[PDB]
Ligand binder design. Structure first.
Ligand code: HEC
Length: 129
């Protein structure tokens, strides 16, 4: 409880930390790695296996708000759809593991996995800054 809002923030923030390389390549940096993404890849699953848990009513809004977080309170309602959303996300990576191979594919594997990325965002992520 003491440190949860962060534990989650870092967990979700890690998504980008791991995608770092996946990004550079995506943008057009470094002659790709694959092995570097491999990890950052399986990282999407794991992170998507400990995310649907650190979402108490102490870090939502209307009191538990910390004027920083960015997670609509509809995540407690759509808890179901919320999971099923981050559920496939872990399946997308599972497949990306074998799928992934090059860069041209990264964008291909980044189609589904990237779905729960922006989907889980626009669905549960009202970015305001
Ligand atoms: C649900 C199916 C998710 C997947 C898969 C990913 N994200 Fe996410 N993200 C989700 C939520 C509910 C939220 C809000 C609460 C929380 O702190 O997680 C977020 C937030 C972000 C942030 C905000 C961080 C900040 O810099 O202020 C970022 C940068 C982020 N999301 C990025 C992102 C990326 C790039 C993902 C895949 C590579 C990704 N997330 C997966 C829900 C879900």
């Amino acid at each position: 409880q003491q440190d949860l809002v962060d534990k989650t923030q870092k967990l979700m923030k890690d998504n980008g930390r791991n995608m770092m390389v996946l990004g550079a390549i995506a943008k057009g940096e470094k002659p790709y790695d694959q092995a570097a993404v491999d990890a950052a890849l399986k990282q999407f699953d794991e992170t998507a296996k400990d995310l649907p848990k650190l979402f108490p009513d102490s870090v939502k809004g209307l009191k538990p708000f910390d004027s920083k977080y960015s997670s609509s309170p509809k995540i407690w309602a759509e808890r179901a759809k919320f999971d099923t959303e981050i559920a496939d996300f872990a399946k997308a990576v599972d497949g990306a593991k074998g799928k992934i191979k090059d860069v041209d594919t990264l964008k291909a594997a980044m189609q589904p996995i990237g779905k729960a990325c922006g989907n889980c965002h626009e669905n549960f992520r009202d970015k305001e800054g």
